[PDB]
Amino acid sequence: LPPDITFDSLALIKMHSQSMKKILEITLAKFTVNLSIVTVYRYLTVRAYLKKNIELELDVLKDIYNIVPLNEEIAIKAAQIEADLMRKGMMPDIEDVLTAATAIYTKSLLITDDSKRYEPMRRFGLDTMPLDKFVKEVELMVEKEL
Amino acid sequence: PLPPDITFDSLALIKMHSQSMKKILEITLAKFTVNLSIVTVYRYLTVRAYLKKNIELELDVLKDIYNIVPLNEEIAIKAAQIEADLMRKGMMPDIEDVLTAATAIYTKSLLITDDSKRYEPMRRFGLDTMPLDKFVKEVELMVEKEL
Amino acid sequence: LPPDITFDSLALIKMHSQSMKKILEITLAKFTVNLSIVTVYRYLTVRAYLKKNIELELDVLKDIYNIVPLNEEIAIKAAQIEADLMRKGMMPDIEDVLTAATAIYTKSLLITDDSKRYEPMRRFGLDTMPLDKFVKEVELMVEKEL
Amino acid sequence: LPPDITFDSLALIKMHSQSMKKILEITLAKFTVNLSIVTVYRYLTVRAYLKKNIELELDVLKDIYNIVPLNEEIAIKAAQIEADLMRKGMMPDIEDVLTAATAIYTKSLLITDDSKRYEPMRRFGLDTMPLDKFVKEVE
Numbered sequence: 001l002p003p004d005i006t007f008d009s010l011a012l013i014k015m016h017s018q019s020m021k022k023i024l025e026i027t028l029a030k031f032t033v034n035l036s037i038v039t040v041y042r043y044l045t046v047r048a049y050l051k052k053n054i055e056l057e058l059d060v061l062k063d064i065y066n067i068v069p070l071n072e073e074i075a076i077k078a079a080q081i082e083a084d085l086m087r088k089g090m091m092p093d094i095e096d097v098l099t100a101a102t103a104i105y106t107k108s109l110l111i112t113d114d115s116k117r118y119e120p121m122r123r124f125g126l127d128t129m130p131l132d133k134f135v136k137e138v139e140l141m142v143e144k145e146l
Numbered sequence: 147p148l149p150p151d152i153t154f155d156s157l158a159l160i161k162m163h164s165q166s167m168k169k170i171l172e173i174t175l176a177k178f179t180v181n182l183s184i185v186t187v188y189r190y191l192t193v194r195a196y197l198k199k200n201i202e203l204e205l206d207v208l209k210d211i212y213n214i215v216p217l218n219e220e221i222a223i224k225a226a227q228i229e230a231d232l233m234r235k236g237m238m239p240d241i242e243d244v245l246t247a248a249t250a251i252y253t254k255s256l257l258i259t260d261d262s263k264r265y266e267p268m269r270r271f272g273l274d275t276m277p278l279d280k281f282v283k284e285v286e287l288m289v290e291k292e293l
Numbered sequence: 294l295p296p297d298i299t300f301d302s303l304a305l306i307k308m309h310s311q312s313m314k315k316i317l318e319i320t321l322a323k324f325t326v327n328l329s330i331v332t333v334y335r336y337l338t339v340r341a342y343l344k345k346n347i348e349l350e351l352d353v354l355k356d357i358y359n360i361v362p363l364n365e366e367i368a369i370k371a372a373q374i375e376a377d378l379m380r381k382g383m384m385p386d387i388e389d390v391l392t393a394a395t396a397i398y399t400k401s402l403l404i405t406d407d408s409k410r411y412e413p414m415r416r417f418g419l420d421t422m423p424l425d426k427f428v429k430e431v432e433l434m435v436e437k438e439l
Numbered sequence: 440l441p442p443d444i445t446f447d448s449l450a451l452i453k454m455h456s457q458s459m460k461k462i463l464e465i466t467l468a469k470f471t472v473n474l475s476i477v478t479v480y481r482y483l484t485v486r487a488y489l490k491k492n493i494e495l496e497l498d499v500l501k502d503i504y505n506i507v508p509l510n511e512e513i514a515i516k517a518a519q520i521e522a523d524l525m526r527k528g529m530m531p532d533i534e535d536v537l538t539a540a541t542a543i544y545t546k547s548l549l550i551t552d553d554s555k556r557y558e559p560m561r562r563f564g565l566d567t568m569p570l571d572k573f574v575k576e577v578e
Contacts, residue, residue, distance in 0.1 A: 037219070040222055041245075044226035045229045046230075049233055055418045058222075058223060067219065069216045070184050070185070072187075075184055079188055079191035082195075083192055086192075086196055147319070147438060148319060331509070333514055334509075334513075337515065351515060360511070362510055365497065368483060369494065372483035372486075376484050387533050
């Protein structure tokens with residue numbers, strides 16, 4: 001529903017698949033997509049692995065997406081998230097905490113195929129939504145003439 | 147005329163900021179340009195927030211004594227290339243290592259660490275390392291000689 | 294500010310002038326300089342015209358610079374770039390195409406006094422920076438330090 | 440006569456044409472052809488302009504020709520050739536200098552459809568022969 005959304009690495013990959021190509025088209029009509037540089041880096045890693053020109057692929061990425069650098073404000077947030085998770089006896093991935101920190105920072109709804117690993121970070125102001133539910137919401141909006 | 151460029155990983159940075167390393171830190175700041183990845187900064191402030199310190203306060207001191215290098219598009223490309231090429235060879239490196247290494251190659255910083263063997267697969271990419279113990283002995287030596 | 298840079302032949306000429314002696318010295322400690330063998334040959338032409346000792350000078354360039362041969366991989370990129378330019382009605386100079394292709398292949402920022410000359414090649418991934426701006430940035434690091 | 444030969448860019452194009460298939464056949468059996476990477480890049484350029492896959496095309500050239508990178512030794516000789524030619528009130532093409540410099544180095548008879556523009560470079564050890572005369576002496 002909100003104007004600002006983001007995706008984590010796997011949801012980004014799904015959103016790029018030929019079968020999402022229509023959902024993507026509507027997504028970019030309707031939402032501002034604020035990707036973490038971590039998500040971009042993880043994505044560019046697998047592209048480069050497939051021997052793609054990642055300098056060119058990044059140019060295409062920044063044409064349709066906002067790419068959010070990892071700065072000092074996000075690092076503060078991520079440290080505080082991680083330390084709290086660690087106090088509660090949990091072992092968060094670095095990629096997750098940094099992706100959540102960036103989403104909290106840009107005030108973006110995080111679209112993910114694995115919502116639950118971000119659940120311990122809800123308490124910090126992260127909104128999340130399952131990819132399959134997000135896909136259903138986008139089609140509904142077209143039906144509702146939004 | 148320019149002071150050599152160096153960096154630290156987060157384990158080494160934590161030790162550089164210990165009570166016992168105050169003078170070494172002070173000499174290090176006077177004699178070198180220290181280019182810290184924002185990711186090393188984040189991992190360091192994680193330790194500090196776990197100890198319930200004032201991370202905003204301490205980050206402002208860090209901001210002042212360190213060149214803090216954000217993770218931007220250019221370092222991400224470099225890190226993506228590094229990591230893809232390591233994978234093309236059977237290896238699955240840690241995110242912290244790759245982004246740390248990639249930032250040190252991009253800033254041309256000697257990476258100072260207690261775990262130099264962990265960083266060996268990235269030598270080919272132009273990473274230079276030096277063990278913390280050896281770096282500390284060398285800083286001590288420069289002070290001895292000048293004084 | 295990136296770690297890998299290069300110069301065209303006219304920029305290299307200036308970099309080795311008397312005025313630029315300290316800048317040159319700072320560049321070599323702060324950066325990796327990846328020079329196309331084409332740039333090197335055009336530089337050596339000027340030097341040979343001034344009745345200098347070009348074999349001796351070359352032996353010094355070899356130790357301070359990464360001199361990049363015109364190999365198969367570069368020849369293919371140069372060819373793709375030039376054909377694409379010709380398809381748009383442009384006739385680029387051989388030295389520009391080969392310089393630009395080598396810099397794309399090496400991922401080096403091309404420092405030059407004639408950035409407009411090279412602008413048709415940015416779409417292929419070429420990064421440039423004016424020599425004046427580069428010099429001033431080097432001088433700034435020195436001023437701040439001293 | 441010599442086992443070592445090379446072509447410049449136009450000559451290579453004409454050697455690759457339909458009419459020259461037999462001459463090319465006898466050329467590849469009789470001679471070692473030492474092609475400058477510069478000749479190759481120029482050839483690949485006109486193929487890419489016709490939207491050919493030059494990776495595929497480079498692989499064919501790789502198998503039939505000795506492709507000669509532009510290295511430090513060639514660069515010195517080209518610099519010397521060029522500076523000298525300039526002091527004598529000329530401005531040679533860069534492609535021509537690099538092509539001549541590579542032929543001197545590989546001690547290759549340069550086969551060209553334009554021998555005259557290479558004439559200033561004879562004094563540096565370059566051997567040239569017209570393609571027309573070459574074709575005659577092949578058949």
